[PDB]
Amino acid sequence: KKEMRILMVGLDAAGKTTILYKLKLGEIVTTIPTIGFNVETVEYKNISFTVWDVGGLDKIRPLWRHYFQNTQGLIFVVDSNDRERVNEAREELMRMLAEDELRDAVLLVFANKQDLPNAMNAAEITDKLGLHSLRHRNWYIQATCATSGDGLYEGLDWLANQLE
Amino acid sequence: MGLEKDFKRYGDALKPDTSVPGKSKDIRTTKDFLNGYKNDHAKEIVDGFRSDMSIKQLVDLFVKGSWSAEQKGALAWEIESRALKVTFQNKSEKYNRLFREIASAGVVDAKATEQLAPQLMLLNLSNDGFGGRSDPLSKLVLVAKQLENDGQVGVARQLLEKMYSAAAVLSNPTLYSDSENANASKLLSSLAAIHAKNPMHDTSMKVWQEKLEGKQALTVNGVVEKITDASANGKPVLLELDAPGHAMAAWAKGSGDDRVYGFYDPNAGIVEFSSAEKFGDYLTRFFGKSDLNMAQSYKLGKNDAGEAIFNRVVVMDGNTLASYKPTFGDKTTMQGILDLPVFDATPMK
Ligand SMILES: Nc1nc2c(ncn2[C@@H]2O[C@H](COP(=O)(O)OP(=O)(O)OP(=O)(O)O)[C@@H](O)[C@H]2O)c(=O)[nH]1
Ligand SMILES: [Mg+2]
């Protein structure tokens, strides 16, 4: 009944494509680095989410802003185990949140790869990304493991509930 | 739609009544327009331009003014940029829904794949104002599928990735090395070379086995029977499908369980199926009134039974096409164009 366009971005290797197809096909697919985008429509309760999975390689990150049209929600996916790049993730998140086109978008952060041994937890990702500083933004952070699917529908449920 | 009306007003103003015949040089081919057509250029050369303008305001500016070809190119870039921004995600969603519905129906085709790379959007980002390279791209993809039939992996996939990469480079040139900038430009001038010396006009080499036109023009179902023909199994089938103003490709490659049937519309992307039935379903519904109706949007003509037909279907000779050299004095073949780099190992600026 309600269509909602979702932009899913994050650094390369975050898990974005894995999440998309875990949600859509119920499977773990063998992925390669996405140079381009994938898109799927995922029906969940009242809502048709069209989810845009856009490549996160640094050399194609400038293209992200070409996918902002009529977007109601932003999914930012962070590799919880990548401590070296978490401040880079934060920089990329904040650049997106600066865009006037996205000023009303709800933000769901997936703190992904919680199964890996040196994974920062949700509270720590929340501080590293500066989420508490986000004023005038409906946001939420969900700990996930894409490969098992743990957390993904909890994430989606929150997002659906915000968008209704 | 306001957009459709405005985009048609804009279109009329590019083919104007000062040279009525669709025989005079179109302004989109001219060096001046093409120099004009790029980002961040209207603000330098077009009086009254403002970047906060709507499409309609830009089209008003276009049609009310007295503009050089270069000024027209800059405005065309700004109008087309915004128009594509409004439409391309809607369109992609639509193509993907049809793919996924067919792939997922009955017995799932687990090997079905889709890769979207809409040319108009990538070429606008690449500051290429010619208005489309469906013919060059369709030919390159058929060469890629010849190469993949013979055992190379992911050649068409990487062509399409390189369109994205070139668009990233050309839209934001200061973030990449001089070498990357030159690479991106060289990819695009290769498409232009292919258009300038089109191998279908080349009589010294025959890149085609058969041209099916006029009288024996094929319907969509005719393309389906040719692609999915089991008599072929083992060997590649490589077709270029020509609407009046747009080229596409379709193929079969691989043997037994690795056999795949694919379709490339440069305006959308590539789909491949392992199921012949599903490939036939996709193509029928892609073109068919009952579904996406691309037969109407590409303005295909009709036969006497009123079924949509392609102006031309070319049954390609892939090994010969692969070896074709689009520019006299340069050894680079169609296969070499496929292999052109865009990114290289230098860290991003
Ligand atoms: N251990 C573990 N591996 C994961 C998880 N999620 C994704 N992966 C793996 O991490 C790798 C990268 O995943 P992708 O989904 O390709 O990452 P991406 O975000 O789409 O990367 P780009 O396409 O470059 O933007 C793959 O090998 C995935 O299987 C997870 O939760 N745990
Ligand atoms: Mg990916």
Short mmCIF file of all heavy atoms in Angstrom, two decimals, chain B residues 9 18 39 44 57 60 63 79 132 147 172 184 192 206-207 249 265 287 307 337:
data_model
loop_
_atom_site.label_atom_id
_atom_site.label_comp_id
_atom_site.label_asym_id
_atom_site.label_seq_id
_atom_site.Cartn_x
_atom_site.Cartn_y
_atom_site.Cartn_z
N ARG B 9 8.99 19.98 -25.34
CA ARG B 9 9.24 21.37 -25.74
C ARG B 9 10.75 21.56 -25.97
O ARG B 9 11.20 22.03 -27.04
CB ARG B 9 8.75 22.25 -24.59
CG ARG B 9 8.78 23.73 -24.80
CD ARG B 9 7.63 24.37 -24.03
NE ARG B 9 7.70 24.18 -22.58
CZ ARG B 9 8.19 25.07 -21.73
NH1 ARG B 9 8.74 26.21 -22.16
NH2 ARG B 9 8.16 24.83 -20.43
N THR B 18 14.39 25.67 -38.95
CA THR B 18 15.41 26.26 -39.85
C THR B 18 16.21 25.22 -40.70
O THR B 18 17.14 25.60 -41.42
CB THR B 18 16.40 27.17 -39.06
OG1 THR B 18 16.72 26.57 -37.79
CG2 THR B 18 15.80 28.54 -38.80
N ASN B 39 28.82 19.47 -16.99
CA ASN B 39 28.48 20.05 -15.69
C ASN B 39 29.19 21.37 -15.43
O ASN B 39 30.23 21.65 -16.03
CB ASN B 39 28.74 19.05 -14.54
CG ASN B 39 30.22 18.73 -14.33
OD1 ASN B 39 30.93 18.28 -15.23
ND2 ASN B 39 30.69 18.99 -13.12
N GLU B 44 28.73 29.53 -16.15
CA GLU B 44 29.82 30.35 -16.71
C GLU B 44 29.43 31.07 -17.99
O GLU B 44 30.02 32.11 -18.30
CB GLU B 44 31.06 29.49 -17.00
CG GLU B 44 31.70 28.91 -15.76
CD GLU B 44 32.46 29.93 -14.94
OE1 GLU B 44 33.25 30.71 -15.52
OE2 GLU B 44 32.36 29.88 -13.71
N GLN B 57 11.66 25.94 -15.62
CA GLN B 57 12.37 27.20 -15.74
C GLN B 57 13.58 27.12 -16.70
O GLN B 57 13.84 28.04 -17.48
CB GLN B 57 12.84 27.65 -14.37
CG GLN B 57 11.70 28.13 -13.49
CD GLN B 57 12.14 28.40 -12.08
OE1 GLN B 57 13.06 27.77 -11.57
NE2 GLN B 57 11.46 29.33 -11.42
N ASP B 60 12.19 26.97 -20.11
CA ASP B 60 11.75 28.34 -20.46
C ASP B 60 12.98 29.16 -20.92
O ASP B 60 12.97 29.78 -22.00
CB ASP B 60 11.07 29.03 -19.28
CG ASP B 60 9.69 28.43 -18.95
OD1 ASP B 60 9.11 27.69 -19.79
OD2 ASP B 60 9.19 28.69 -17.83
N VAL B 63 14.09 28.04 -24.44
CA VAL B 63 13.28 28.34 -25.62
C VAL B 63 13.06 29.83 -25.83
O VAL B 63 12.81 30.23 -26.92
CB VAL B 63 11.91 27.65 -25.62
CG1 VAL B 63 12.08 26.15 -25.51
CG2 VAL B 63 11.02 28.20 -24.51
N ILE B 79 19.34 20.48 -18.18
CA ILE B 79 17.98 20.00 -18.30
C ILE B 79 17.99 18.48 -18.22
O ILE B 79 17.21 17.89 -17.47
CB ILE B 79 17.35 20.47 -19.64
CG1 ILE B 79 17.04 21.96 -19.58
CG2 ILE B 79 16.04 19.76 -19.95
CD1 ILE B 79 16.94 22.60 -20.93
N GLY B 132 23.33 9.40 -26.75
CA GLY B 132 23.18 7.93 -26.65
C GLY B 132 24.24 7.21 -27.45
O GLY B 132 24.65 7.69 -28.50
N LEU B 147 33.53 -13.49 -26.56
CA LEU B 147 34.71 -13.76 -25.74
C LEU B 147 34.38 -14.65 -24.54
O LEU B 147 35.20 -15.50 -24.11
CB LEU B 147 35.40 -12.45 -25.30
CG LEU B 147 35.86 -11.53 -26.43
CD1 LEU B 147 36.51 -10.28 -25.86
CD2 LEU B 147 36.83 -12.22 -27.40
N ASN B 172 33.95 14.31 -11.69
CA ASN B 172 34.73 14.84 -10.55
C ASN B 172 36.23 14.71 -10.85
O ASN B 172 36.93 14.00 -10.14
CB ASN B 172 34.43 14.06 -9.25
CG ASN B 172 32.98 14.18 -8.80
OD1 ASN B 172 32.23 13.20 -8.81
ND2 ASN B 172 32.60 15.35 -8.38
N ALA B 184 39.42 7.50 -18.79
CA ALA B 184 37.96 7.69 -18.92
C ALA B 184 37.58 8.33 -20.23
O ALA B 184 36.69 7.81 -20.96
CB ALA B 184 37.41 8.47 -17.74
N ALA B 192 32.70 6.73 -29.62
CA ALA B 192 32.58 7.65 -30.76
C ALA B 192 33.30 7.16 -32.02
O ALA B 192 32.79 7.39 -33.12
CB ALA B 192 33.09 9.04 -30.40
N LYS B 206 33.53 -8.75 -43.08
CA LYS B 206 32.10 -8.98 -42.89
C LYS B 206 31.86 -9.38 -41.45
O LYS B 206 32.10 -10.52 -41.10
CB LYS B 206 31.62 -10.09 -43.82
CG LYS B 206 30.17 -9.95 -44.21
CD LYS B 206 29.85 -10.80 -45.43
CE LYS B 206 29.09 -12.05 -45.06
NZ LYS B 206 27.66 -11.74 -44.78
N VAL B 207 31.40 -8.45 -40.63
CA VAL B 207 31.15 -8.76 -39.21
C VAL B 207 29.80 -9.45 -38.99
O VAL B 207 29.56 -9.97 -37.93
CB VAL B 207 31.22 -7.54 -38.28
CG1 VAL B 207 32.62 -6.95 -38.31
CG2 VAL B 207 30.17 -6.50 -38.62
N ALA B 249 20.90 -5.69 -27.81
CA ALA B 249 21.52 -6.96 -28.13
C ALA B 249 20.87 -8.14 -27.39
O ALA B 249 20.30 -7.99 -26.31
CB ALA B 249 23.01 -6.89 -27.84
N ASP B 265 19.55 -4.09 -23.11
CA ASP B 265 19.11 -2.76 -23.56
C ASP B 265 20.00 -1.73 -22.91
O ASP B 265 19.95 -1.55 -21.68
CB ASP B 265 17.65 -2.54 -23.15
CG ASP B 265 17.15 -1.18 -23.51
OD1 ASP B 265 17.94 -0.35 -24.02
OD2 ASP B 265 15.99 -0.91 -23.14
N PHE B 287 8.94 -6.11 -24.16
CA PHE B 287 8.49 -5.36 -25.33
C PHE B 287 6.96 -5.23 -25.40
O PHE B 287 6.45 -4.24 -25.95
CB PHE B 287 9.02 -6.04 -26.58
CG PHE B 287 10.48 -5.80 -26.81
CD1 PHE B 287 11.40 -6.80 -26.62
CD2 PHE B 287 10.92 -4.59 -27.27
CE1 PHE B 287 12.74 -6.58 -26.89
CE2 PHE B 287 12.26 -4.36 -27.57
CZ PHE B 287 13.17 -5.35 -27.35
N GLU B 307 1.93 -7.24 -35.63
CA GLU B 307 2.90 -7.59 -34.57
C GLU B 307 4.14 -6.73 -34.70
O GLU B 307 4.55 -6.40 -35.80
CB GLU B 307 3.32 -9.04 -34.70
CG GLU B 307 2.17 -10.03 -34.72
CD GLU B 307 2.62 -11.43 -35.09
OE1 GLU B 307 3.48 -11.57 -35.99
OE2 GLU B 307 2.14 -12.40 -34.47
N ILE B 337 39.11 -2.63 -26.89
CA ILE B 337 38.28 -1.55 -26.31
C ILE B 337 37.61 -2.05 -25.04
O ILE B 337 37.68 -1.37 -23.99
CB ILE B 337 37.26 -0.99 -27.33
CG1 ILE B 337 38.02 -0.15 -28.34
CG2 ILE B 337 36.20 -0.15 -26.63
CD1 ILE B 337 37.25 0.14 -29.60
#
